[PDB]
Amino acid sequence: NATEIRASVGKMIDGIGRFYIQMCTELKLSDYEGRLIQNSLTIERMVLSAFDTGGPIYRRVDGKWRRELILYDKEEIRRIWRQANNGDDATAGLTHMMIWHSNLNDATYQRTRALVRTGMDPRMCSLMQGSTLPRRSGAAGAAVKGVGTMVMELIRMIKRGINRRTRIAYERMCNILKGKFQTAAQRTMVDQVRESRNPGNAEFEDLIFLARSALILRGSVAHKSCLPACVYGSAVASGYDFEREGYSLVGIDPFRLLQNSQVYSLIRPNENPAHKSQLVWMACHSAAFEDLRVSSFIRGTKVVPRGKLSTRGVQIASNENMETMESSTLELRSRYWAIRTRSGGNTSDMRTEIIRLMESARPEDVSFQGRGVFELSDEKATSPIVPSFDMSNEGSYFF
Amino acid sequence: NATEIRASVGKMIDGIGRFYIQMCTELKLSDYEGRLIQNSLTIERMVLSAFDTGGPIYRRVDGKWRRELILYDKEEIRRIWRQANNGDDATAGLTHMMIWHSNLNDATYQRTRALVRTGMDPRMCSLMQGSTLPRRSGAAGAAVKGVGTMVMELIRMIKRGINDRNFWRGENGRRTRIAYERMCNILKGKFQTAAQRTMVDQVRESRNPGNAEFEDLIFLARSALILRGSVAHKSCLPACVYGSAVASGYDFEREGYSLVGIDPFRLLQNSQVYSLIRPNENPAHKSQLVWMACHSAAFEDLRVSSFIRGTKVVPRGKLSTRGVQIASNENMETMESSTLELRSRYWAIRTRSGGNTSDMRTEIIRLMESARPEDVSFQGRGVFELSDEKATSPIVPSFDMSNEGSYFF
């Protein structure tokens, strides 16, 4: 059923577009200045703030870039927003940029300080997908969350409490949690946790276990390709009428759109452009915890690890100066595309059950058997391509 | 030094009187109206509601009485205040009003509602003195408050942080903690035994105050039942009286006034103060009340209470009167006004001491274990006559005559 799902989400994409265009028309920005991922970000956040303000806005004068600090009627923003969505709320829409930000943050930063202070192992990076994503996120907003993400929450919710209506949350938060697991025991053990009203260290220690079980017996976590507002604004302005022509966040749509996007970015004096583009590209698909090998394969070019990456962050801090600042054109095109999946793959004390399953598991264990990559011409999911990694690679752990 | 105090006191007294006058002179009152206790309380309230306004103002239509829910412009009241007060902000004066009320409050309502609530034993009245006094009252406010109240406010927080909204955390949390500490130090201050005091320190040294800390305070509170705490007793009078007093041109600023001496009794002695009373009550029973409230002798031994006064001071459970102020829910055509018997044969001085004698928990028990109700405190002090204006002839009474039921409540 390509009617609702493909076209209803198109309508949510149209809104973001239209809005971005309106909002650019207010700031009286130029074309080059509306394609500046920097300005786009600021706008996106102005809105999510107002629906739950001012921000940094960069301008282009003969030669150099001028940063403007501006403020807008928090309500005016809310007004312009609905105008674009037919006076609707389109929570989906706000939630969408709510994720684009997430996926950018899960790739720009490593959230160790928080994991440890929670009592999670810092090496549990690949499980913190969407830890930045405000709880306000929608129902299809949490589905993108990693197993580890959920645990950090419950553990804090529990840690302060064990240190009224709050209950329905906890059970559900677990049901979701449990719905991440895709194996008997995994599933069953979550229940054994959800049994206690005042779950103390008994649980505190057990979920942490299950957290680690997912490192081997992963769960189902959806990935959503959420592009910057500018990309959708520009597309809408170019005539693309997505609600009519349909759009996806896990199909070929997002890659194809990024195959023509003209996004620019501010870039510090010593930073590497190629390295900058990489970053953004990984935020456009939630590939911050993907196997670098595959990311590079699909990308078309080296996908260098975080450490070796030359950049501190896409947003420009108030600290920096504009004199020594310039801007490059972001390389967002990719070689092939792939169905962003949700599945994690698979081959007494319920712990034992898992520990026993954990064991038989080898890192070499092939997942998504038969699934492959698609050419950018292959609109339909017709012919798949299987990658062979016998190759001089460059790692697998972005972090 | 000593001559100063009395000046400021007078200075304050004077201000107050000067004020209540202006209020009468305002509402176009009379000698009578301006002496009715109920009318006074309404004023004082409004004088306080103006520094964070309305109340019932009583008038007499020959045959019956009148209510008039007066709403006087807030900012104006606080402005006539400085006028009457030389353009000084008499905050102390405003504190005097507050206390008068607290002391009239303890003398009427038994605060059990709140005790069982915070988990304190319902039998701790002896300790809940000055509890209705808001935080808005300074050091004066605290000196008056007692162990019960101090514990109560501490337990209130201990618990408020168990629901824990990060109660003791973050920039504001750290600010609360500071407060919690202050209050711990206030409690500790009142204690006379190092054991109690040292044991306070053991509680305020925690950072996750919970049941542990909680039970230790309930403990410290029982102890104050026998190892008396050191509390402050003052003599605060309805400003209607202070009005009449300045009337005579009695300049307290000169003549000096005090809140722990004879001066308070001197006024109440020559003073005409009425109060509205409903049917089925003994018009003397209200007198006791107001009188008690005036001296804060709500938790004083009924003996020393009934002796210090000429008549026999009866307990609450045989005092037919449900308070000074009057509700709006019931008949006002049956309001017999009466003159309050606010006099006493003898006057005594109010004091601070309670006459005083986890290892601390095991050791405090000893002291308690050692105390006896038959122990005499304040050896050497007695009651004085109104002719002995300079406390000099102690009349140390012989008490136990089987009329022992000193527990007002």
Cα distance from B154 to chain A (closest Cα, Å)? 20
Taking CA–CA distances from B168, the nearest residue in chain A reads: A160
- Helices and strands, number each (H, E), in chain A: 17, 4
Q: What are phi and psi of B138, to 5 degrees?
A: -75, -150
Rounded CA separation A359/A95 (Å): 39
Interface of chain A against chain B, CB under 8 Å? Answer: 160-161, 163
In three state form, how does the secondary structure of B167-229 look? CCCHHHHHHHHHHHHHHHHHHHHHCCCHHHHHHHHHHHCCCCCCHHHHHHHHHHHHHHHHCCC
For residue A161, which residues of chain B lie inside 8 Å, CB to CB? 164
Contacts with A163 from chain B: Cβ below 8 Å: 164, 208
**A162 min Cα distance to partner chain B (Å):** 10
3-state secondary structure of A208: helix
Residue in A with minimal Cα distance to B163: A161
Decide if A163 and B164 are in contact by the 8 Å CB cutoff.
yes
Report in angstroms the alpha-carbon separations of A22 from A27, A77, A264, B248: 9, 10, 19, 79
CA–CA distance, A336 with B326 (Å, rounded to integer):
85
* Distance in Å, alpha carbon of A158 to nearest chain B alpha carbon: 12
Q: Which residues of A touch B164 (CB under 8 A)?
A: 160-161, 163
Instruction: Determine the Cα–Cα distance for residues B157 and B360; give it in Å rounded to an integer.
Output: 23
Taking the CA atoms of A310, A315, A321 and A324 in sequence, report the sign of the dihedral they define: positive
Element (H, E) at A56: strand A54-60
**Which of helix, strand or coil describes residue A58?**
strand
Minimal CA separation from A170 to chain B, in Å = 17
Q: Which residues of B touch A (CB under 8 A)?
A: 164, 166, 208
Give A117's contacts in chain B (Cβ within 8 Å).
none
Q: What is the CA radius of gyration of chain B?
A: 22
The alpha-helical segments, DSSP class H, found in B191-322 are 194-204, 211-226, 239-247, 252-255, 262-269, 285-295, 302-308
CB distance A391 to A270 below 8 Å: no
Task: Specify the DSSP class assigned to residue A373.
Answer: B
Q: Are strands B64-66 and B59-61 parallel, antiparallel or unpaired?
A: antiparallel
Sign of CA dihedral A320, A324, A327, A332: negative
Count of A-B CB contacts under 8 Å: 5
Name the closest residue on chain B to residue A156, using Cα atoms.
B166
Residues of B in contact with A160 (CB under 8 A): 164, 166
**Selection from A240, A249, A154 nearest residue A194 by Cα:** A154
Report the distance separating Cα A270 and Cα B60, nearest Å.
90
In degrees and rounded to multiples of 5, residue B398 shows phi and psi of -100, 110
Instruction: Single out the residue of A303, A149, A278 nearest to residue A222, CA to CA.
Output: A149
Residue B158 to chain A, least CA–CA distance (Å): 14
Give B166's contacts in chain A (Cβ within 8 Å).
Answer: 160
How many angstroms separate the CA atoms of B235 and B296, rounded? Answer: 7
Q: Tell me the shortest Cα–Cα distance from A354 to chain B, in angstroms.
A: 36
Report the 10 Å Cβ neighbour count for A76. 11
Write out chain A residues lying below 8 Å of B208, CB-based.
163
Would you state the structure tokens that stand for residue B404, as one six-digit string?
Answer: 């022992």
Contacts of A162 in chain B (CB under 8 A): none
Closest Cα in chain B to A164: B163
Per DSSP, the residues of B55-100 read EEPPEEETTEEE--EEE--HHHHHHHHHHHTTT---HHHHHHHHHH
Cβ of A163 and B166 within 8 Å?
no
Task: Calculate the CA B130 to chain-centre distance.
Answer: 5
CA B129 vs CA A195, B145, B157, B234, B285: distances in Å: 47, 5, 19, 12, 21
Q: Closest Cα to residue A224, out of A103, A314, A136?
A: A103
Among residues A186, A225, A223, the alpha carbon closest in space to that of A207 is found at A186
**3-class SS at A44?**
helix
Distances (CA, A) of B73 to A114, A260, B46, B54, B95: 55, 70, 10, 9, 21
Residue B255: partners with Cβ closer than 8 Å, 6 or more residues away: B10
**How far apart are the CA of B113 and the nearest CA of chain A, in angstroms?**
24
In our burial notation (b when 16+ CB lie closer than 10 A, e otherwise), range A360-399 reads eeeeeeeeeeeeebbeeeeeeeeeeeeeeeeeeeeeeebe
Asked if A161 lies within 8 A of B164 by C-beta distance, the reply is yes
The residue with tokens 């007093």 is B245
Q: What are phi and psi of B252, to 5 degrees?
A: -60, -25
CA–CA separation, A107 and A398 (whole Å): 9
- Say if the Cβ atoms of B208 and A163 lie within 8 Å: yes
Structure tokens at B247: 């009337």
Across the interface, do B208 and A160 touch by the CB < 8 Å criterion? no
Structure tokens at A13: 């994409």
Residue A69: its H or E element: strand A65-71
CB contact under 8 A, A161 and B166: no
Query: Which of A160, A164, A166, A198 has the most B C-beta neighbours within 10 Å, making it the best mutation to test the interface with B?
Result: A160
Pairing of strands B274-277, B69-71: unpaired
Q: Which residue of A has its CA nearest to B169?
A: A160
Tokens of residue A77, six digits: 């923003």
Q: Is B321 in contact with B289 (CB distance < 8 Å)?
A: yes
Give burial (CB, 10 Å; 0-12/13-18/19+) of B58.
buried
Helices (H) and strands (E) in chain B, counts: 16, 8
CA distance A147 to chain B (A): 26
Phi, psi of A82 (to 5 degrees): -65, -40
Amino acid (1-letter code) at residue B255: E
Residues with Cβ within 8 Å of residue B326, at least 6 apart in sequence: B38, B56, B276, B278, B332, B335
Where in chain A are the domains?
1-399
Chain A: give the shortest CA distance to residue B147, in Å.
29
Question: Would you tell me how many other CB atoms lie within 10 Å of the CB of residue B283?
Answer: 16
Taking a C-beta distance cutoff of 8 angstroms, is the pair A36, A265 a contact? yes
Name the minimum distance, in Å, from the CA of A161 to any CA of chain B.
Answer: 7
How many Å apart are CA A398 and CA A345, to the nearest integer? 20
- Nearest residue on chain B to A161, judged by CA atoms? B164
Residue B5: CB partners within 8 Å, gap ≥ 6?
A: B258
The DSSP H or E segment spanning B42 is helix B37-49
Amino acid at A395: G
- The pair of structure tokens assigned to A209 is 């276990």
Rounded CA-CA distance B55/B110 in Å is: 24
Ramachandran assignment for A239, one of left (phi > 0), alpha (psi -120 to 50 degrees), beta (any other): left
For A158, which residue in chain B has the nearest alpha carbon? B164
B409 CB-near residues (< 8 Å, 6+ apart): B110, B125, B315, B316, B317
Beta bridge partners of A264: A36, A329
When scoring A157, A158, A163 by the number of chain B Cβ atoms within 10 A, the one with the most, hence best to mutate, is A163
Q: What is the CA radius of gyration of chain A?
A: 22
Q: State the smallest CA–CA distance between residue B120 and chain A in angstroms.
A: 24
How far is CA B84 from its chain centroid? 25
Amino acid (1-letter code) at residue B88: D
